[PDB]
Design a protein around this ligand. Structure first.
Ligand SMILES: Cc1ncc(COP(=O)(O)O)c(/C=N/[C@H]2[C@H](O)[C@@H](O)[C@@H](OP(=O)(O)OP(=O)(O)OC[C@H]3O[C@@H](n4ccc(=O)[nH]c4=O)[C@H](O)[C@@H]3O)O[C@@H]2C)c1O
Ligand SMILES: Cc1ncc(COP(=O)(O)O)c(/C=N/[C@H]2[C@H](O)[C@@H](O)[C@@H](OP(=O)(O)OP(=O)(O)OC[C@H]3O[C@@H](n4ccc(=O)[nH]c4=O)[C@H](O)[C@@H]3O)O[C@@H]2C)c1O
Ligand SMILES: [Cl-]
Ligand SMILES: [Cl-]
Ligand SMILES: [Cl-]
Ligand SMILES: [Cl-]
Ligand code: NA
Lengths: 351, 354
């Protein structure tokens, strides 16, 4: 039964629908530099993911370029290269591009950047990762950054539809980013999205286009903080089509998969720390064993994320050593989930 | 009075060969591998090598866009050498070469041949230079090669707009340590977004793993991200649209762009010159770049036309002079010879009155 597990659901273009969308590009020859699909996808994300009016929805080439475009747009707006802190327990994106010199601190046992490690250092802002659809105690980060006059970015690459105190977690902090990578529940190919305070929208949007704004004619000015960060309308069509056809099923079924693990926890495993009242929509089901173990002991498709960016961060390393990332996708059967739980019970008994 | 020119577009009308694109992407549907180097990437990199004639000494590495080809190239070389390398770029170019890992590159003027003024780096500390082959025109490539050899400097050609201009019998992309090309929709060979790195094999591995955050899955637990890396890879969906467009069009684009250049070469309007170019055969141009003898405004030209490049440093005098004197005329496979002569008619009329 577990032989046919896949990391990602089988995804295939709805060709008739993708062709209908890109017909708009064919009619004007505008397939990028903000063609006719970008507004359609940004709208659909706003309305389907429930983003608030005080937030821009800005699609980009990938989750990484969503984070980098966000920072570059903010840097240009403030006339300074801002210094960010990120947690060790995250993907490389938050220590690359305009963040290549970001400060790396440990997480606390609740899965997010340890606020204790930024008490006595110089920084403009923090990046907190909501791990694989799970969310931190978001209001403790909002409150701290408010009291210290710091920018707050949520790395929601893997966290497009987990609700915190009645709204999409993407609506908290000054900004968040989402990934539409093929491996994300909502993704298809490559893509990213910035959810950000309107204060920064214009500088971020022109910052996808080297800083250039055609509407300014002769005073259009590049920024050395910008790049080519835009989403191509081809990619926007594939992602919008996948979302139109699947987004509601993904939300419901991922929540149901979470329910089975929550009510049938395997022996000596705990759910990854989460602070949502309703079940999170996960990119994988993250469990923590009570002690370090190797993946090669687990006899079905599984992974460990995230190898600490700084291998010296103790909680990050402990989590990495104890974590199991189980496939979570709309192809999973309840039968496969109960078989996985039975295998992990057996794993615990032998280990 | 020129409704015959009302239909001019900057770019040829491009539409997917849906059957060809669907055939290519069926490889992705079979395995669910649409990115992270799916089954189309090797096919597009092979097609570019065989079609553009890239030597076996060079890796062909596709990327998300021409800007990411340049940035992934520099980020991979930075990782291999163990430091953030200092590049000089020319003011008369696109922003890409003063962004990302090049955000602090040194900017210098061009000489009147359209490339980086080598006399301007006399007393600078730098590791390499980036020279822009403007809109398919090439610089005296061997001048730059000899200089970078004598001075032990890395040489990158920004060929964003220059995928098939030959210098001494080989594609200009084959010269220096590396070049990059753009498959942006606005590029003759482009469709949507895309880029390509042509680079000495010495750097191939660091650049390829640098598309994937510096991670190498073949190292297992020793796989290690680099702060010099990013997400720079080309999505196989994009590879399929670009490959299909190249397969159907690249030979016609080379021949037709050469034919269009030939008409301008033999019917130059009064007081305009061809942008400087050092190839023996006609270049393959993203636009026909003419220099008027005097500064002028685009709003005097009664047909679709542009100016490139606004100088990155507006205190670069040769760069500003070119900008003020340049006219970038549409060059694509939809243009009729009849339209080109109506354009030259308009530009003689412009010249006599300015
Ligand atoms: C020397 C050099 N180096 C690097 C790069 C970076 O490559 P990449 O990252 O691929 O853009 C470039 C890129 N040059 C290109 C760039 O790709 C494109 O956006 C464009 O810039 P820009 O003129 O600012 O873009 P635009 O105003 O939106 O479009 C130019 C014309 O192109 C038309 N166009 C534009 C997009 C489209 O989908 N279809 C289309 O027909 C558009 O209607 C307009 O008529 O031209 C540049 C010369 C370069 O020239
Ligand atoms: C916290 C955080 N922040 C930022 C980003 C950056 O977003 P983006 O720039 O979109 O990747 C991310 C991205 N995380 C993702 C990333 O997008 C993806 O490449 C992947 O990384 P990695 O595990 O190194 O890649 P992989 O080894 O190629 O693929 C993981 C699995 O996914 C399967 N896969 C992969 C690609 C595909 O097309 N189809 C497919 O089935 C693949 O077969 C394998 O089983 O997972 C990360 C968790 C993040 O987790
Ligand atoms: Cl809640
Ligand atoms: Cl679908
Ligand atoms: Cl030659
Ligand atoms: Cl075609
Ligand atoms: Na054809």
């Amino acid at each position: 039964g577990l032989e046919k597990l896949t990391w990602v659901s089988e995804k295939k273009p709805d060709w008739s629908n993708v062709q209908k969308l890109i017909a708009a590009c064919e009619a004007t020859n505008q397939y990028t530099n903000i063609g006719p699909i970008i507004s359609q996808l940004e709208s659909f994300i706003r309305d389907s993911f429930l983003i608030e009016e005080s937030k821009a929805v800005i699609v980009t080439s990938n989750g990484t370029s969503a984070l980098h475009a966000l920072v570059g747009g903010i840097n240009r707006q403030l006339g300074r290269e801002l210094k960010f802190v990120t947690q060790s327990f995250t993907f490389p994106s938050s220590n690359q591009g305009p963040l290549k010199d970001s400060i790396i601190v440990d997480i606390d046992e609740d899965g997010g950047l340890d606020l204790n490690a930024v008490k006595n250092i110089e920084y403009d802002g923090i990046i907190v990762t909501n791990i694989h659809g799970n969310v931190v105690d978001i209001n403790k980060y909002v409150d701290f950054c408010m009291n210290h006059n710091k920018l707050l970015i949520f790395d929601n690459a893997a966290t497009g539809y987990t609700f915190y105190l009645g709204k999409n977690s993407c609506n908290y902090g000054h900004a968040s980013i989402i990934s539409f990578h093929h491996t994300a529940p909502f993704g298809f190919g490559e893509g990213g999205c910035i959810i950000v305070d309107r204060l920064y929208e214009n500088n971020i949007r022109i910052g996808l286009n080297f800083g250039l704004d055609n509407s300014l004619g002769e005073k259009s000015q590049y920024s050395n903080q910008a790049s080519n960060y835009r989403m191509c309308d081809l990619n926007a069509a594939f992602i919008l089509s996948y979302l139109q056809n699947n987004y509601k099923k993904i939300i419901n079924r991922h929540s149901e998969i979470y329910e089975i693990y929550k009510n049938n926890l395997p022996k000596r495993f705990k759910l990854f720390p989460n602070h949502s009242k309703k079940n999170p929509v996960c990119s994988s089901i993250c469990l923590l064993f009570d002690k370090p173990f190797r993946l090669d002991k687990i006899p079905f498709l599984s992974r460990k994320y995230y190898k600490p960016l700084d291998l010296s961060s103790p909680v990050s390393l402990d989590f990495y050593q104890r974590i199991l990332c189980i496939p979570c996708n709309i192809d999973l059967t309840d039968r496969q989930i109960y078989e996985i739980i039975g295998v992990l019970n057996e794993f615990a008994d032998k280990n």
